[PDB]
């Protein structure tokens, strides 16, 4: 517990309408930007960590549409 909240580390188990917010946080959106800019392989150690981070982040759901779309769209404009 960090001041009451359980962290998601691998040692732990798990009329105008209002202006809406994106369903990702800005830490999560910054994480997505860093992982995608590391996974385009400018540096190899950066890639390898980003690949391990993708391979074992438990909270990588609810970001997965944006990763699948980045993959799919990328291969089609990368061929």
């Amino acid at each position: 517990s960090i001041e009451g909240c359980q962290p998601a580390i691998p040692e732990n188990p798990p009329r105008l309408k209002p202006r809406s917010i994106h369903e990702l946080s800005v830490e999560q959106q910054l994480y997505y930007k860093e992982i995608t800019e590391a996974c385009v392989g400018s540096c190899e150690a950066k890639r390898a960590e980003a690949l391990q981070s993708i391979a074992t982040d438990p909270g990588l759901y609810q970001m997965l549409p944006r990763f699948s779309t980045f993959i799919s769209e990328g291969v089609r404009v990368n061929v």
Partner: protein
């Protein structure tokens, strides 16, 4: 709102107040010829990406479809408008 958009409809009406059902079967990997897509010899403080319509993504719009109709007993009268400001291209 009787006088708002759809006033023409309101005036015409004359209302004046004021196992094959398993979820996987329907996933589009099992229902789409995605093979055709494979290219055969082709020749963040503010959001990075667009915010989707919460009503389409979340709401049950299916509840505004009609099971039975012309031969049925329900009625309607003036309804409001809202003007979502999330959409760009709207001056106000």
């Amino acid at each position: 709102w009787r006088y708002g958009p759809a006033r023409l409809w309101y005036d015409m009406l004359g209302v004046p107040e004021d196992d094959l059902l398993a979820d996987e079967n329907f996933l589009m990997v099992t229902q789409l010829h995605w093979e055709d897509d494979i290219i055969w010899d082709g020749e963040p403080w503010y959001s990075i990406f667009p915010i989707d319509n919460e009503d389409l993504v979340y709401g049950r719009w299916e509840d505004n479809i009609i099971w039975d109709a012309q031969a049925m007993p329900r009625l309607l009268e003036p309804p409001v408008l809202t003007l979502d400001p999330n959409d760009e291209n709207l001056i106000l």
